[PDB]
Design a protein around this ligand. Sequence first.
Ligand SMILES: *[C@@H]1O[C@H](CO)[C@@H](O)[C@H](O)[C@H]1NC(C)=O
Ligand SMILES: *[C@@H]1O[C@H](CO)[C@@H](O)[C@H](O)[C@H]1NC(C)=O
Ligand SMILES: *[C@@H]1O[C@H](CO)[C@@H](O)[C@H](O)[C@H]1NC(C)=O
Ligand SMILES: *[C@@H]1O[C@H](CO)[C@@H](O)[C@H](O)[C@H]1NC(C)=O
Ligand SMILES: *[C@@H]1O[C@H](CO)[C@@H](O)[C@H](O)[C@H]1NC(C)=O
Ligand SMILES: *[C@@H]1O[C@H](CO)[C@@H](O)[C@H](O)[C@H]1NC(C)=O
Ligand SMILES: *[C@@H]1O[C@H](CO)[C@@H](O)[C@H](O)[C@H]1NC(C)=O
Ligand SMILES: *[C@@H]1O[C@H](CO)[C@@H](O)[C@H](O)[C@H]1NC(C)=O
Ligand SMILES: *[C@@H]1O[C@H](CO)[C@@H](O)[C@H](O)[C@H]1NC(C)=O
Ligand SMILES: *[C@@H]1O[C@H](CO)[C@@H](O)[C@H](O)[C@H]1NC(C)=O
Ligand SMILES: *[C@@H]1O[C@H](CO)[C@@H](O)[C@H](O)[C@H]1NC(C)=O
Lengths: 342, 204, 216
Amino acid sequence: VWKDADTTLFCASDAKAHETEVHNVWATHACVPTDPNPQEIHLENVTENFNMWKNNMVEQMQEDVISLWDQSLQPCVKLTGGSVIKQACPKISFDPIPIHYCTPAGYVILKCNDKNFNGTGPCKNVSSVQCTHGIKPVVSTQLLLNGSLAEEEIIIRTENITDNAKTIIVHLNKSVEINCTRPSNGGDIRKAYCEINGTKWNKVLKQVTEKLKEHFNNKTIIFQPPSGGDLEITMHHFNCRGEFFYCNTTQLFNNTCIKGCNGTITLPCKIKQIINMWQGTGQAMYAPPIDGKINCVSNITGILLTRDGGENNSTEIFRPGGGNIKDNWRSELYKYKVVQIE
Amino acid sequence: DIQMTQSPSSLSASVGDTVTITCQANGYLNWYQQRRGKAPKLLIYDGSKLERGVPSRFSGRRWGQEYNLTINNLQPEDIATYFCQVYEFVVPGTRLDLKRTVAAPSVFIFPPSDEQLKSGTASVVCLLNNFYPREAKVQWKVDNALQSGNSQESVTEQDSKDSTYSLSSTLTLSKADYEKHKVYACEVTHQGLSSPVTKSFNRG
Amino acid sequence: QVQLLQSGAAVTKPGASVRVSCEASGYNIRDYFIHWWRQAPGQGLQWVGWINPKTGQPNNPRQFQGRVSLTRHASWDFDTYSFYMDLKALRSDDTAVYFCARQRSDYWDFDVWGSGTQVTVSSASTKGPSVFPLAPSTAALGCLVKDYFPEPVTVSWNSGALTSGVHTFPAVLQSSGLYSLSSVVTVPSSSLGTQTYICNVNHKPSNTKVDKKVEP
Ligand SMILES: *[C@@H]1O[C@H](CO)[C@@H](O)[C@H](O)[C@H]1NC(C)=O
Ligand SMILES: *[C@@H]1O[C@H](CO)[C@@H](O)[C@H](O)[C@H]1NC(C)=O
Ligand SMILES: *[C@@H]1O[C@H](CO)[C@@H](O)[C@H](O)[C@H]1NC(C)=O
Ligand SMILES: *[C@@H]1O[C@H](CO)[C@@H](O)[C@H](O)[C@H]1NC(C)=O
Ligand SMILES: *[C@@H]1O[C@H](CO)[C@@H](O)[C@H](O)[C@H]1NC(C)=O
Ligand SMILES: *[C@@H]1O[C@H](CO)[C@@H](O)[C@H](O)[C@H]1NC(C)=O
Ligand SMILES: *[C@@H]1O[C@H](CO)[C@@H](O)[C@H](O)[C@H]1NC(C)=O
Ligand SMILES: *[C@@H]1O[C@H](CO)[C@@H](O)[C@H](O)[C@H]1NC(C)=O
Ligand SMILES: *[C@@H]1O[C@H](CO)[C@@H](O)[C@H](O)[C@H]1NC(C)=O
Ligand SMILES: *[C@@H]1O[C@H](CO)[C@@H](O)[C@H](O)[C@H]1NC(C)=O
Ligand SMILES: *[C@@H]1O[C@H](CO)[C@@H](O)[C@H](O)[C@H]1NC(C)=O
């Protein structure tokens, strides 16, 4: 017998002490080494309720990354209320590493094994572990990168789908590479591009529309561009090698392709020095991009969408979304829950 | 796919009374009060949870698919429109009024001003004054002919004290047509009046 | 103390554009969604959309899609915010009171509302009203306020000395495009002959002030 409880976790990783990479340095001082052989025990005939949307595990990972970024990439310029801060802002090595979250003495983590679990409700196949799986603290919008895949089939997560103010998380059951480079000799040095296999993407994209039909009474499913807002959300915002990329994904949500829709899709990108910090603390300013080829190959494993409100009846409309980076952490911790041993 | 309906949409009750209205929705329902010309005021959230700084007369029942809104000890300040809301969806609402001040209208008739006739326009105004209930019937007779299509009437909100209404009907026609007939009548029909009251005047 | 303050009334020709503002203050503003609503004359409310203050993200229904643009900007200390609604290509039936409100919970409960902003859409240039007298015959009398645009006018009597039994009817929309109302009052029969009765009419949009004396 136990009970749902909150407490301070701790973290584990395989940070190398010689690495100058920023995630490596942080985890070297904040995290314990990983356990070679972790135990998992499957609990017989036990049912626990989960709620990925009210899971304090998230808050803590959030504090971790905010602290990671605040120590590691500080801008040349930032605002503080009504004052301008100037500091040295040198280039850094940037490649996020998997971080496991671990309970202290007197607590455990409960894990859901139901393959079609949406994140909110009863779970029948429950086990127990000492730590989560390794989670890369990847920050991005619109698309979810380098995460974990649903064990087939595809899953829709919300909290309340009938609420249009509630972000929808689509969890893929097969991944699609995304290949982004700012070419060698830099001639706009800020001009970059992202490449996706259209044949693979459009099949997956069609399947998502099929699953959305299940939650929306066989209505027609249409994708549309973001309606407005900060550039960090209208574009596909992410960090690669320390540089701030913004990509146009109009071509990524093409309803006609769901003729010549099989070719390699190329998305136009740009590297920006002036940004709005995801921490929510206003504008910052960074140095021009480094020299040479800058390449990021990632897996798309999930999408964040927002449904148009109001009376539509005939159709439902879905535009890409984001901004709340806690939702990135929710996409990986949806299956975990802390309890205290009574 | 959220659907919701309303209840009677118009009812009347006396001072210090208990009134209820019902909606039938499938989501988080809220209740608002709106006085004429002003912004809405929240009264109840989630069906039963009473908003602070709001008289304890109000309450809500959260059983099944229907949502009740109750008002005890009806005060003069409580007279306004009320409506429910689920997410982005809202119903028109339900008007409110009191009872039992059964009074006849003080029916008057007004000819056009001489200053008006210089600009080639004649507006005849018939006035009903202080009555209850609001249901009345006004028809213009010109030389004993029913006038239809060329009339605009206007109604006031229920007066705070005497609890009565007022209606003003304006017949509007060209100067040439006004100087064409002699007798203009403004017959009035009310449930209170034993007989229809007819007021008239001869042009000149 | 929380506070939502909306801008002054608007008047425009069809096909044009208008911007209404909403300024929030005394609370933690990044933590709440702001919705816009509108109310056409004699009609119920109608959802215009929401905007996330943190990101600027808008959500609008099908009809206002294409038109309408929700925006926000914050002060230096993030202590005060301004929320704009830019409605494009105005149609006559866009005439409504535009509200802004705060969404407190997931209950979509709105506890704090803006005062409202009057937005009038039509042709019809600004015109003062003509005030004609309504001769009396207890008895009754009043004034006729014909042909003005836009609303509203404010009618009193004897510079606000006579308020008893005053019935100022809500204006009506004449087929021309101009509004018109009527103000009346009731007095004893012995009143006529000694007392001076004056109706005070003000139409600010045309800067037209008129004091008329009613008499048999
Ligand atoms: C529960 O889930 C695990 C997956 O980790 C699976 O291997 C196991 O067979 C399931 N147990 C039962 C009996 O459903
Ligand atoms: C997730 O599953 C639970 C249990 O069936 C259900 O209550 C909830 O509505 C589901 N969420 C959705 C529809 O995504
Ligand atoms: C890309 O996804 C594949 C599985 O489809 C996986 O093997 C690989 O680890 C992923 N690459 C990453 C996360 O860098
Ligand atoms: C992923 O799930 C869909 C149904 O949601 C299913 O059609 C498909 O077979 C699954 N993909 C794979 C690779 O198994
Ligand atoms: C990614 O794209 C670049 C440039 O088009 C190409 O050189 C590289 O081979 C691609 N990498 C992979 C693994 O797809
Ligand atoms: C692109 O995606 C399709 C769909 O799976 C795949 O079959 C094809 O081999 C890919 N094209 C490449 C890797 O050249
Ligand atoms: C993305 O590209 C499309 C098509 O070129 C363009 O219409 C749109 O303005 C772009 N979106 C953003 C946010 O830059
Ligand atoms: C979808 O893709 C097709 C194939 O390239 C393209 O021609 C078309 O313009 C796209 N549809 C849009 C963006 O309207
Ligand atoms: C995903 O993983 C690959 C290495 O496996 C890395 O190169 C890439 O930077 C990661 N994605 C992002 C945007 O961090
Ligand atoms: C979500 O909200 C609805 C409407 O208020 C409520 O009836 C329902 O129980 C909730 N469902 C979920 C998925 O939590
Ligand atoms: C008010 O609501 C309750 C709950 O549904 C309902 O049973 C009852 O009939 C209503 N009360 C009145 C006075 O009709």
